[PDB]
Amino acid sequence: VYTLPAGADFLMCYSVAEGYYSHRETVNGSWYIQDLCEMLGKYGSSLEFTELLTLVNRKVSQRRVDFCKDPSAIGKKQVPCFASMLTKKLHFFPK
Amino acid sequence: SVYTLPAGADFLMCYSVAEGYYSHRETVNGSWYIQDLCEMLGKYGSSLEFTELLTLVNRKVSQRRVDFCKDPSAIGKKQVPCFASMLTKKLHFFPKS
Amino acid sequence: MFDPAEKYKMDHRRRGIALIFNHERFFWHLTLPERRGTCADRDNLTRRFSDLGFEVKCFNDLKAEELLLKIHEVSTVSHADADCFVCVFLSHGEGNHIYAYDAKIEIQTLTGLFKGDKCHSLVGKPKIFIIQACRGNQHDVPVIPLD
Amino acid sequence: FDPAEKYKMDHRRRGIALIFNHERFFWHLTLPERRGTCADRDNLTRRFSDLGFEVKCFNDLKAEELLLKIHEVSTVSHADADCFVCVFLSHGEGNHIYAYDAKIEIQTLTGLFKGDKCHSLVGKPKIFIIQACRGNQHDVPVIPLDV
Ligand SMILES: *CCS(=O)(=O)N1CCC[C@@H](C(=O)Nc2ccc(OC(F)(F)F)cc2)C1
Ligand SMILES: *CCS(=O)(=O)N1CCC[C@@H](C(=O)Nc2ccc(OC(F)(F)F)cc2)C1
Ligand SMILES: [Cl-]
Ligand SMILES: [Cl-]
Ligand SMILES: [Cl-]
Ligand SMILES: [Cl-]
């Protein structure tokens, strides 16, 4: 067979791209974990996990800062970022 | 339709290697990563989702190893590429028109 | 045949461990803001990963020594009968570091424990890191498509 | 909310694929020549042309020339294009890529195509492909415990 790189088969899922702030709703948690969990609830046991993370990018991209003591932050945005060193399709079908 | 977009959304950053690592080459036919990317584009570019295709590129580059080097400690060494997605939708390159 | 539809083998006895490091407050001398709502995030992830068959192990406000001991321990147990590994950090960060309660830790130290040469029983298996942390001090700005 | 949603790829043109191909460097950079990059550039040109891209290749541009060319492409109309591809075949250092004579922050190059700078690519994919070493560690071979 072929050997693998010791760094293969990692998936790094970040709330934001390097350089940017991440955001939260006042009480119910971060934008990113709320939207990740909603997508896990609806699609986690069927969709390929990177397809699911792409839906999370779309969902978080719809959010905006509604309330902030800094008025320059109002209306500001976030897109998450996932970095894949995966080599195969990843599914969490029911066991 | 109803929502604004982040100015940084819908970027895809495709790297030959993860941060911190050397990338490799054959030298006649070029880099491991561009050779395997181009082979997958040739076979699957017009059908597969582009991140699905990049995952096949990760698998193909992961199969390679350093066979010849003046540094003998480098023999058998390895590379995995890395793609960073800020995409929000599926990306296909179906034939135009 | 190189099969473009190839899936990771996910028919092991166990899904695997989902580790969650949940950081709400920090050592006063770090002058880091409280992460109000992180307990909702931790509970939401616990439910969703449990529903996907993970053994969820949550740790709240660990200090650097405690967090390193715990993650090192998980890296040295057998994952031979597991499909995969998930590790979640809910905290502040700085560059390529994540904050424990008292100090920051290089992210490469944490992922390094699960690399193929350190964690033989996860070779060929997905290692999934999920990091909720700001990664700089710029706010992304809103745009709309032309038309 | 449709989980199968695809980018709109039915515009008149696929769009531009920009390729910055760097084989040799200003002698005072002490950077090794990139023997084989010619093969990579030609291979990409064929594959992207076959996918409908207008491929525009530049060999061994100096920093000023590279910035002028990429700024030009960021300020033309992509209203009738599906997407944008940009390829760098060069050496790098941290979050920099090398032109012939000097390094350039990758964020300056990607930044030109952000939605607030490039209105006609808003809602469209921007794809950056970078063939460059990203440090001085060789990854090591491992085998799954199963075999
Ligand atoms: C109104 C303040 S803001 O929106 O301009 N912004 C300032 C920069 C930091 C941002 C922030 O607080 N981010 C954040 C903190 C904690 C998080 O986790 C959570 F607490 F669990 F939700 C997520 C995001 C705010
Ligand atoms: C035997 C030398 S090695 O394989 O240990 N290794 C040392 C570190 C750098 C590696 C290398 O040359 N990588 C590389 C250089 C140039 C590239 O672009 C290309 F020339 F177009 F292919 C790709 C990869 C060698
Ligand atoms: Cl998707
Ligand atoms: Cl963002
Ligand atoms: Cl800002
Ligand atoms: Cl091994």
Numbering used by the authors:
A (entry chain F): 197 to 291
B (entry chain B): 196 to 292
C (entry chain E): 30 to 176
D (entry chain A): 31 to 177
Excerpt from the paper describing this PDB structure:
Caspases are cysteine-dependent aspartyl-specific proteases involved in a range of cellular and disease processes, ranging from apoptosis to inflammation and neurodegeneration. Caspase family members are broadly classified as inflammatory (C1, C4, and C5) or apoptotic caspases. While often classified as an executioner caspase, the function of caspase-6 (C6) in physiology and disease has remained enigmatic, and it has been suggested that C6 may act upstream of the other executioner caspases. C6 possesses a non-catalytic cysteine (C264) not present in other family members and is situated on a loop in the small subunit at the distal end of the active site.
Analogue 2a, having the 3R configuration, exhibited markedly superior C264 engagement compared to its 3S enantiomer 2b, with a mass spectrometry-based dose–response-50 (DR50) value of 0.08 μM and a C6 inhibition IC50 value of 0.180 μM, indicating that inhibition by 2a involved both molecular recognition and reaction with C264. However, the location and orientation of the piperidine ring and sulfonamide function were quite different in the two analogues. Lamin A cleavage was inhibited by 2a with an IC50 value of 14.2 ± 2.4 μM and by 3a with an IC50 value of 170 ± 4 nM.
